[PDB]
Enzyme design. Sequence first.
Site, short mmCIF file in Angstrom:
data_model
loop_
_atom_site.label_atom_id
_atom_site.label_comp_id
_atom_site.label_asym_id
_atom_site.label_seq_id
_atom_site.Cartn_x
_atom_site.Cartn_y
_atom_site.Cartn_z
N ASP A 138 0.86 -1.17 0.00
CA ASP A 138 0.00 0.00 0.00
C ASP A 138 0.91 1.23 0.00
O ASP A 138 2.07 1.16 -0.41
CB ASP A 138 -0.85 0.00 1.29
CG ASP A 138 -2.23 0.63 1.08
OD1 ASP A 138 -2.39 1.61 0.32
OD2 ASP A 138 -3.17 0.12 1.71
N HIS A 194 -3.72 6.23 3.62
CA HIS A 194 -4.39 5.00 3.22
C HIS A 194 -3.86 3.81 3.98
O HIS A 194 -4.62 3.08 4.62
CB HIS A 194 -4.23 4.78 1.71
CG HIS A 194 -5.20 3.82 1.10
ND1 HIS A 194 -4.83 2.55 0.69
CD2 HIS A 194 -6.52 3.95 0.79
CE1 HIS A 194 -5.89 1.93 0.18
NE2 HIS A 194 -6.92 2.76 0.23
N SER A 223 -10.83 -1.87 -0.19
CA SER A 223 -9.61 -2.09 0.59
C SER A 223 -9.95 -2.34 2.04
O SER A 223 -9.42 -3.27 2.66
CB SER A 223 -8.70 -0.88 0.47
OG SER A 223 -8.17 -0.77 -0.83
#
EC number: 3.4.21.-
Lengths: 10, 477, 92
Positions: free
Chosen positions: B26, B59, B219
């Site tokens: 990520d 994120h 996700s």
Amino acid sequence: XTAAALFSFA
Amino acid sequence: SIPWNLERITPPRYRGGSLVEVYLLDTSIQSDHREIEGRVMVTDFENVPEEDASKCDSHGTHLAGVVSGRDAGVAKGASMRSLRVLNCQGKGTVSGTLIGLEFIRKSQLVQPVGPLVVLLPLAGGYSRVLNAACQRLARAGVVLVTAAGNFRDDACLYSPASAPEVITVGATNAQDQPVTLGTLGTNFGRCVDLFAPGEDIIGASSDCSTCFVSQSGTSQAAAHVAGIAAMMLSAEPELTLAELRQRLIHFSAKDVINEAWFPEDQRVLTPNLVAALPPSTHGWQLFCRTVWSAHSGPTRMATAIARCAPDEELLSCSSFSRSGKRRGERMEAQGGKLVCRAHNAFGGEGVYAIARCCLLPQANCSVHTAPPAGTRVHCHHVLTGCSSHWEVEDLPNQCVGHREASIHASCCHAPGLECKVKEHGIPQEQVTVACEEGWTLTGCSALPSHVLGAYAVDNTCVVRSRAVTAVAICCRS
Amino acid sequence: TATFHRCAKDPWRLPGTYVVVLKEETHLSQSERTARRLQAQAARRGYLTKILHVFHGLLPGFLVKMSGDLLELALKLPHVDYIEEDSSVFAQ
């Protein structure tokens, strides 16, 4: 988000 | 106080993840964050395109938290290792993702640990090489969890969602419905394996070392399944990918999504599952899944094929066509292993093959076939599935077919197996018959007045018609 | 028999970089030589290339920065299975 449904659906 | 998503994946009866490592591919992560500090090892593998400080690691910090954070994580223990394949704007490349998956395999070879879960909370278009890499890394014994994609589209058009031998997760909301926001929302289709919470998910926020934020996405949903998998693999280290995927399916909430959120052609293809941790209870039991093939296409000699995992048995085989122009299905041997093959009819848009794959060890399984004559075959142990295929263009432990078709019996020598047949007929667009609690649907088919196909949905046999009789075969220990 | 593939979503394509994927049993030593051969044949034609990475462990093959003009040449290299043009992946 631009440009792929990124970050909680834009 | 317990966030809605963590309550949602809690079983109806209850009471980890440390012999397991969860790799995260990520953005960068704020490893100092109190949710995850001391739990996540930044590998400092980095391969990202150039952009076109706390926005950067937002994120991945969130997702690191959803998997393993101490207040809001699914697998609150859980060692994580993080690789950076997304830049500060969230953009990566296939090639960079390839190198990171390669980096995980090199680390595993150099310093072997235990079970490995790789989380891929990212998507781009369908990629042959990314799907190839994911499959080959799965065949090396690694579990991959991937997001379906946020485009409200067919996940099979996205990678690594479409990747074979990978667990692809769509997102549902607090009402158990698929996330929709504008024209965006969770992907769907037969490449999605299950759904998990993915709207309004509280996790670590990189704004400050003790801050929290809500994020939505597939996700986030995959992060749930990855922590769910890490705990299953902690409890049962020896699980194969088929045995872990059969448990994810078995332990999911069922028929809880309103299929009307999905495009019409995708309702039959999309599994109605919302992921959940397994209960306190768990003796052997019979797990089956339904495996849909890719659409065969319209060529007149087209065949769809549906395959089970190497350690599963193909207990039944059916086919479905939206127009009803089809020539049935048969089971065939390939590699000493049975597969499910469906035939398109001349002039049809294609068919699907629909396999019923089950963890049935100690099983010797064979096919009994009869050519056109009504047509009949039977076993001479236990009948698990009926199949039928014809060559023309139009019209106990036994199978019965149309006079002009072949029929096929899946017969299994399985001691400890008990099976029963349950029928339901009506005067009607869809006819339905389900196995009783504790039994597993192994075979579904329609008695031979014009059928679109039949398929197992969980333990319900569903027959689709343009007297129609649904026939369910149900087994247990 | 070697085939070329690029992303069907045009705005996600990244031209200029290609993943050359080799046949399953291909050994690392072969991958390195096949990359060096590509660089060589491209240089004889006037093209600078850059071997950004050589793959081994999951897929054999390599990652090359080169003009797409060379895809016909690169597809005829020994041991080649398919070539894929790089593309974007995105946080979801």
